[PDB]
Amino acid sequence: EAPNQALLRILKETEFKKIKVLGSGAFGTVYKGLWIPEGEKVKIPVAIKELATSPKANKEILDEAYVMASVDNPHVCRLLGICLTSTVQLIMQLMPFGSLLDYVREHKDNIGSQYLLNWCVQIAKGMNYLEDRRLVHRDLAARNVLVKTPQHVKITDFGLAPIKWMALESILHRIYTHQSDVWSYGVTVWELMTFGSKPYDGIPASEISSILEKGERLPQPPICTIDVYMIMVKCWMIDADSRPKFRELIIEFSKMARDPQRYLVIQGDERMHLPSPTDSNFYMDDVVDADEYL
Ligand SMILES: CCC(=O)N[C@H]1CC[C@@H](N2C(=O)N(c3ccccc3Cl)Cc3cnc(Nc4ccc(N5CCN(C)CC5)c(C)c4)nc32)CC1
Ligand SMILES: [Cl-]
């Protein structure tokens, strides 16, 4: 396999300021922040993950840093660098609007078919990239998609060692493949097309495995034409080579994205508007997004 020449950037903790905490797990804490490379006159919005030391955890966060440093694609999250303090810190571009799953629940009343279909395209491009790079996600789901702007999303939490999102060969044989990812993409779309609902609500985790051999799948969401639902259902076929290739999903969803209301029927579609930072506001003055800093 080819030599992996990702650059790993070490940042100084004095070069950034934690501002608000975005979440707190037992393992660690993720902060909203700014990063100021000194003498470059830029303020990069970032997210800062910090663990407070466990030998095993220190190793895993560096595995994460290893993967996140290796990808570069507009619909995949990447690492800006790490900071070697008492406890290591991973430094990521900030995704201001959080996770897609939260974003479609809270902004449900204003999410029209154009956004829903573009998200599907963008998530498919993400996974097709992870396919080109022969990297299988193994944990794709609406919560692991982050929204930079409502018009731009990126996959996170990918490639690191949730049955309801798992292809069947992943459940019975613990097989994980790109076509296993195609299945979880399917559930992911279903999450968006239902505006955040929970898949297989109220079921035993165990039953799911024979439910799928029996042949049951998830329901058709109301807004979903047969054209969209069919594409999902093809992600849940059992023979993994009949399931679609992300590169096809890109095409098919991108086709539908040209005539959105022919493929998703949403009451009051054309009335809806979502914050576009170009459109409404970009609301400490001098700041560049990490994507324009490379
Ligand atoms: C796991 C413990 C945990 O709680 N994780 C969650 C919180 C951190 C979050 N997160 C990362 O983990 N990143 C990352 C991934 C890998 C390595 C390093 C890193 Cl830095 C990069 C990241 C970038 N941008 C955001 N934007 C963003 C997030 C949340 C919120 N709101 C605040 C108000 N609400 C109550 C709900 C949340 C908002 C408004 C904006 N969140 C990120 C992922 C999920
Ligand atoms: Cl689950």
From Swiss-Prot:
Residues that bind ATP: L22, G23, S24, G25, A26, F27, G28, T29, V30, K49, M92, Q93, D157
Crosslink site: Glycyl lysine isopeptide (Lys-Gly) (interchain with G-Cter in ubiquitin): K20, K41, K56, K59, K214, K245, K255
Result for mutant: P3A: Reduced phosphorylation
PTM-bearing positions, type Phosphoserine: S276, S280
Phenotype for L8A: Abolishes phosphorylation
Phenotype when changing G23A: Found in a lung cancer sample
Resulting phenotype, G23D: Found in a lung cancer sample
Outcome (variant: L160R): Found in a lung cancer sample; somatic mutation; constitutively activated enzyme with strongly increased kinase activity; more sensitive to gefitinib than wild-type
Site (Important for interaction with PIK3C2B): Y293
Main function: Receptor tyrosine kinase binding ligands of the EGF family and activating several signaling cascades to convert extracellular cues into appropriate cellular responses. Known ligands include EGF, TGFA/TGF-alpha, AREG, epigen/EPGN, BTC/betacellulin, epiregulin/EREG and HBEGF/heparin-binding EGF. Ligand binding triggers receptor homo- and/or heterodimerization and autophosphorylation on key cytoplasmic residues. The phosphorylated receptor recruits adapter proteins like GRB2 which in turn activates complex downstream signaling cascades. Isoform 2 may act as an antagonist of EGF action.
Name assigned to this protein: Epidermal growth factor receptor
Natural source organism: Homo sapiens
Name of the gene encoding the protein in the UniProt record: EGFR
Parent sequence residues shown: 697 to 1017 of 1210
